[PDB]
Write a protein that binds this ligand. Structure first.
Ligand SMILES: NC(=O)C1=CN([C@@H]2O[C@H](COP(=O)(O)OP(=O)(O)OC[C@H]3O[C@@H](n4cnc5c(N)ncnc54)[C@H](OP(=O)(O)O)[C@@H]3O)[C@@H](O)[C@H]2O)C=CC1
Ligand SMILES: NC(=O)C1=CN([C@@H]2O[C@H](COP(=O)(O)OP(=O)(O)OC[C@H]3O[C@@H](n4cnc5c(N)ncnc54)[C@H](OP(=O)(O)O)[C@@H]3O)[C@@H](O)[C@H]2O)C=CC1
Ligand SMILES: NC(=O)C1=CN([C@@H]2O[C@H](COP(=O)(O)OP(=O)(O)OC[C@H]3O[C@@H](n4cnc5c(N)ncnc54)[C@H](OP(=O)(O)O)[C@@H]3O)[C@@H](O)[C@H]2O)C=CC1
Ligand SMILES: NC(=O)C1=CN([C@@H]2O[C@H](COP(=O)(O)OP(=O)(O)OC[C@H]3O[C@@H](n4cnc5c(N)ncnc54)[C@H](OP(=O)(O)O)[C@@H]3O)[C@@H](O)[C@H]2O)C=CC1
Ligand SMILES: Nc1nnc(CCC(=O)c2cccs2)s1
Ligand SMILES: Nc1nnc(CCC(=O)c2cccs2)s1
Ligand SMILES: Nc1nnc(CCC(=O)c2cccs2)s1
Ligand SMILES: Nc1nnc(CCC(=O)c2cccs2)s1
Lengths: 249, 250, 252, 251
């Protein structure tokens, strides 16, 4: 019987490459999504075409709120409903936009940025552990977390909290055989709304190849941390940044 | 004329020693509190006995919610109403209790992330918005043990990591306005009120420097340095005040 | 042809496991040794039995001295002589012992061994490795220490060398990236405990490890090395992977 | 009686600023120097005309060698000879220049100077400081805030400053029981090298978020003075960045 993984924000970009690569490794997958319904459903079809009954979709808003715990419990519950087990959780979903200190309500910006990047991962980790071989969690962190983008306070706080969670849950879940690690991209797939000139400005800064990471290169690191080659690894965060975080201003 | 500071959770313990030390240095002070009204008022009276009209109190719950932004705006406003200015913000208030992975979880999230992280972000926003030979700065009370966390304190540890993030992010963003943003990071200081001496001792014995916890006044000393003219080039720094505790392996 | 790797201190323990696992992945290997000749040759014998002329040995003291540059240039040249290429360098050799601040080697000898092996030799080997490609998956892996910020009592010099090694890892990652040479680290917590250590003291450390109350096997350390040199890590440089079972996360 | 401090590389720039501010705080000072004999004697002269018998100079090469231990032992002995005590050691002296990995002095010499001045000498001075020991004893190591975002082709210099972080933490741990605190001060850009042209100076100035300017030597000395003071009696193994946000700025 094949293991199963939840990947949050799996319909597009990095999360999709992660779900595809896990599926290629033999995992059954829950493709969580928020708005990208048609892409998620299309991805599940593609994966079910390759090996039937190996992929389902699962819709959830991961904004912070009083019902977020129920939503997170449901994501994990859906893996058991589909596959009777849940071996891997990948915390990938993330809101990302500026929140300047000096000038959507601030209430909403806090809920979305802290919710998706930190609180939902925490609640998913809780539900993962409570519902419980080679069990592990991978959190998508940020290699630039100590050299953050200007005016991205709330986002930076979320990713910083995600580091805290990675370490805290590694320590706490170790006695249950659950490993908790992170993969930290620098620049990978650049945001759709970012202009081409700004994209080339970031590309030029990467020491290794003057280019961004492909989604697949990020996924490769995830695959390593969930595999048998990482059985002793927990609380570790692997930068996949082409040296970007090493470059001074 | 005298600068003014806001200290959150200033009724007791570390917050109180910080408020007392800032006042002795010549600052007028907003003593913010949540439940400790009698202690906040007593401190205010003591300080006002030293120099008239130099201390006020301000009550607010710093738990995350829809009203939190308004409460934080109000805390900062109280300093302007009382003193006409606000030169220093000290984010000290903090909830601290275990949240094991395996009182509702949404309230734990609201309390632990609210007090330790979101409230400080909101207060920083409001502090800076109102400033848009002056030495403006913010001190965030962090945790020296943030990368070697207490077992089953994930939410608290997440709040404190977030606070490091804010410290760095706000330092970068507010530097053009000449607002410095720094942190003080205790290891073990004033231990929980009722903790047995045998348990207190277990922690004291781990501290390389003197086998004792930090006094609130020693934590306060580092805050005083960071708000002073001797730290005018220091921003985004987090000073550990831990007697070497974070350096000790398991 | 097959890629070629240099592993320093590869005769025993963690270096042996790294050299073995690299050999099993298809690398030809230079087994460097200082005092462990018998061990290095018997590993080469075992590897060459699997695939003929894929393993050679190379002797050198990695202590800091006026001749260290020459010895490091020769370790790297041994790879080019044997195999015609050098694709991977694993800086594994390490001296490890206490150097108390407050009180039969002299202190200047302790400096030469602890800083030489853990930091200077890695730097010189990195330099020679890079120069011999100055005129396709090139990388260096440095054996670091997960406990570097919570150091063993009275191990100042050792700890200085492992800190220096982090610096080397980052500086060389930055400088060599335009040459397509990646530079990373693997950081064990408690793996194979030293032969010198008493059994009760071994169990003391084993008990502190969150993940399974046991030390890392040498092969688990080697697994992270294999990952870092592989095509699955083509965008990774200046990274240091802890392989410590969560030990570094545990407070006093 | 007045406390006494050793400051390495104290003839000029940041080390001088540190020596001056410790002297203004009431310390007697040992002004260590290597080549800057004239400027060292001149500083000692200025300080002694402020208070008699409160400054001495001490010559020493801090390049790594088999004699370096005796040299460092003698620096410490010189403070006890002049002043009868040694309360503070400041590790300030530092060689700084490129060592490209891919292509002057020999590589042996570069290792000896860059690792010796930045790491080995601080280690041996710490050893001798501790061995020779109301009281407020401490050591301050001049580190680098850009240690994890290093200057291109400065491997050996960066290895040394990294090693200095290791020593700061290792010594803090080991000397705590003796009541000796060990901390660091990490500048980003302070006094730029005299060799650097004004255009490259401004380039570096422009990058600093706080004021678009380098730290003054006095601003560095302030943080040193705090760490040696009674306001820091619980602080050990801490490295204070004095960098105006420089290390926080992405590429
Ligand atoms: N791209 C890069 O260069 C970098 C990425 N990272 C991290 O790696 C991970 C993946 O990156 P990337 O693919 O760019 O991520 P994206 O920014 O593309 O976001 C991925 C998914 O997050 C989901 N999401 C956003 N808001 C919510 C919400 N409120 N509730 C539920 N889901 C939500 C969205 O799903 P939907 O489309 O279904 O609505 C989105 O597709 C993230 O954690 C990111 O922070 C870190 C550094 C750099
Ligand atoms: N003490 C130590 O050893 C350590 C302390 N620290 C940090 O140093 C700082 C001060 O420490 P310490 O004195 O122990 O702090 P305490 O735990 O004593 O808490 C300080 C004050 O926080 C306020 N507070 C708690 N919850 C709320 C809330 N929901 N809304 C508003 N205020 C609230 C309380 O005010 P009220 O009484 O008026 O209700 C409390 O008195 C904290 O940030 C702490 O995390 C870090 C490591 C160790
Ligand atoms: N073992 C563990 O738990 C931990 C290991 N590490 C790092 O992992 C790596 C491997 O660890 P481990 O296998 O225990 O290493 P060892 O301590 O067993 O040393 C490995 C080899 O280093 C070589 N060596 C020692 N001194 C010299 C010298 N002066 N010149 C040349 N070679 C020398 C020796 O070769 P020979 O026998 O041929 O003379 C020795 O066999 C090391 O870098 C270590 O620092 C980090 C943390 C923990
Ligand atoms: N300046 C800056 O922007 C930064 C400085 N720092 C650190 O702060 C500290 C002070 O900086 P700065 O004033 O610029 O230092 P300098 O570069 O001016 O060096 C200070 C002194 O180091 C001494 N020195 C050099 N080589 C030797 C040697 N072989 N033996 C003995 N002494 C030697 C020299 O003494 P003499 O003249 O007597 O021969 C020199 O005057 C240093 O540790 C530096 O690395 C860190 C980051 C940035
Ligand atoms: N959820 C997301 N997090 N980060 C994203 C893109 C990151 C990005 O655009 C840059 C990162 C560093 C310089 S630019 S999407
Ligand atoms: N808000 C608070 N944060 N930390 C507090 C007390 C710290 C404490 O008891 C210990 C911290 C680490 C070992 S014991 S109160
Ligand atoms: N060269 C070596 N480096 N580290 C070695 C053994 C590691 C070891 O015993 C411990 C390291 C940290 C706690 S115990 S050998
Ligand atoms: N001993 C010394 N160390 N650092 C010195 C000057 C540092 C310097 O010029 C810069 C550091 C980072 C950008 S420019 S002298």
């Amino acid at each position: 019987e094949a293991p199963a993984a939840v990947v949050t924000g799996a319909a597009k970009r990095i999360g999709r490459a992660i779900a595809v690569k896990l599926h290629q490794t033999g995992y059954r997958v829950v493709i969580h999504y928020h708005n990208s319904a048609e892409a998620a459903v299309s991805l599940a079809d593609e994966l079910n075409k390759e090996r039937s009954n190996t992929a389902v979709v699962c819709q959830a808003d991961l904004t912070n709120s009083n019902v977020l715990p129920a939503s997170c419990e449901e994501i994990i519950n859906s893996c058991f409903r589909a596959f009777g087990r849940c071996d891997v959780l990948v915390n990938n979903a993330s809101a990302f936009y500026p929140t300047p200190l000096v000038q959507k309500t601030v209430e909403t910006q806090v809920a979305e940025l802290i919710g998706t990047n930190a609180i939902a991962p925490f609640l998913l980790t809780m539900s993962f552990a409570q519902r419980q071989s080679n069990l592990s969690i991978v959190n998508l962190c940020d290699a630039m977390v100590d050299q953050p983008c200007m005016a991205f306070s709330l986002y930076n706080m979320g990713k910083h909290a995600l580091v805290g969670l990675t370490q805290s849950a590694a320590l706490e879940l170790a006695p249950y055989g659950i490993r908790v690690n992170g993969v930290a991209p620098g620049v990978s797939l650049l945001p759709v709304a970012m202009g081409e000139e700004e994209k080339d400005k970031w590309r030029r800064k990467v020491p290794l190849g003057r280019r961004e990471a492909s989604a697949e290169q990020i996924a490769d690191a995830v695959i390593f941390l969930v595999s048998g080659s990482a059985q002793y690894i927990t609380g570790s965060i692997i930068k996949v940044d082409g040296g970007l975080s090493l470059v001074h201003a």
